[PDB]
Design a binder for this molecule. Structure first.
Ligand SMILES: C=CC(=O)N1CC[C@@H](Oc2cc3c(Nc4ccc(F)c(Cl)c4)ncnc3cc2OC)C1
Length: 324
């Protein structure tokens, strides 16, 4: 009827996680960094760990296990996958640590060192990620630069599947209802009719690319969310970022067409951004571009800027830790 989801959900003992330190907190809950030392392995795996506030709110464990389901069912170089869960007082999600954090913050804090080649490569990688999600019939529904993580400056991955939805073997639109929504990243049809498709995700990709190309500007800044559907109906759109050629901005604009089926396919975005990445200074115009550098895996205090030296002997990235 539809293919069986044979993903493994790994239950991980609390006694295998060490050096637990806070990365951030809020409504979403708390995320920590830590090490995961599977027992009798001789590996230490850098991890992030997401928990909500309290063992209560049966709603909350439902939401987070919904997220776990989705994160366990993906496997792609440009998507974050679940390593497992920990069943404590609270339900904790465990995943590969992405040490440079979220891309929104990254572009903000490193504006002066981000050249054309990085921007376009990110665009390619996010498109690969999103294409993979489409092939697996998932609609993310919250693609935003905040929901893209940086493993290294060269390697980003989509995360935050807490709003993602599958689609039946012959179903096209998800129809949602209520709940707080990222209105500024949403297709018009999603705001108006709570319709959500692969093509509504393309809209969100457009906005995400705008965020990167403006070094993390806030879209429709100062506009109240309640006014967005009108702005859009009138035909207004996010403006051309200074660094963008018409070539790049046109792609953005095509992502924001009213006719969903007229928007680009992720497979097409991969191709276009890939072509652009072979000659980046032809497509993005950044002052002092050719002379920028960001941390690479082949640098000294790359592995020392994260780790304790006590640990480093047996550290293995989650991307190199695979199980039967
Ligand atoms: C409250 C959050 C917050 O404000 N921020 C903002 C900074 C961000 O910092 C990191 C988060 C990481 C992460 N997140 C994650 C997502 C879904 C999951 F299901 C799980 Cl298990 C984790 N994954 C991996 N690496 C992360 C690294 C981060 O910063 C170094 C959290």
């Amino acid at each position: 009827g539809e293919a069986p989801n044979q993903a493994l959900l790994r239950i991980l003992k609390e006694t295998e996680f060490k050096k637990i330190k806070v990365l951030g907190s809020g409504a979403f809950g708390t995320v920590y960094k830590g090490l995961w030392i599977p027992e009798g392995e001789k590996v230490k795996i850098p991890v992030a760990i997401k928990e909500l506030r309290e063992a209560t709110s049966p709603k909350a464990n439902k939401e987070i296990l919904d997220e776990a389901y989705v994160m366990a069912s993906v496997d792609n170089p440009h998507v974050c996958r679940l390593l497992g869960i920990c069943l404590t007082s609270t339900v904790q999600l465990i995943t590969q640590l992405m040490p440079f954090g979220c891309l929104l913050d990254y572009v903000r804090e490193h504006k002066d060192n981000i050249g054309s080649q990085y921007l376009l490569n990110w665009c390619v990688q996010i498109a690969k990620g999103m294409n993979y999600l489409e092939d697996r019939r998932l609609v993310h529904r919250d693609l935003a630069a905040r929901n893209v993580l940086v493993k290294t400056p060269q390697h980003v991955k989509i995360t935050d599947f807490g709003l993602a939805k599958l689609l039946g073997a012959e179903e096209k639109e998800y129809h949602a209802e209520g709940g707080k929504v990222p209105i500024k990243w949403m297709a018009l049809e999603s705001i108006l009719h709570r319709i959500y498709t692969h093509q509504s995700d393309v809209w969100s990709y457009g906005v995400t690319v705008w965020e990167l190309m403006t070094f993390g500007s806030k879209p429709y800044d100062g506009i109240p969310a309640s006014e967005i559907s009108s702005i859009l109906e009138k035909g207004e759109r996010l403006p051309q970022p200074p660094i963008c050629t018409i070539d790049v901005y046109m792609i953005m604009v095509k992502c924001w067409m009213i006719d969903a089926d007229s928007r680009p396919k992720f497979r097409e975005l991969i191709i276009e951004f890939s072509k652009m990445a072979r000659d980046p200074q032809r497509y993005l115009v950044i002052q002092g571009d050719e002379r920028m550098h960001l941390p690479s895996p082949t640098d000294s205090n790359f592995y020392r800027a994260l780790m304790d030296e006590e640990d480093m002997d047996d550290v293995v990235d989650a991307d190199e830790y695979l199980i039967p």
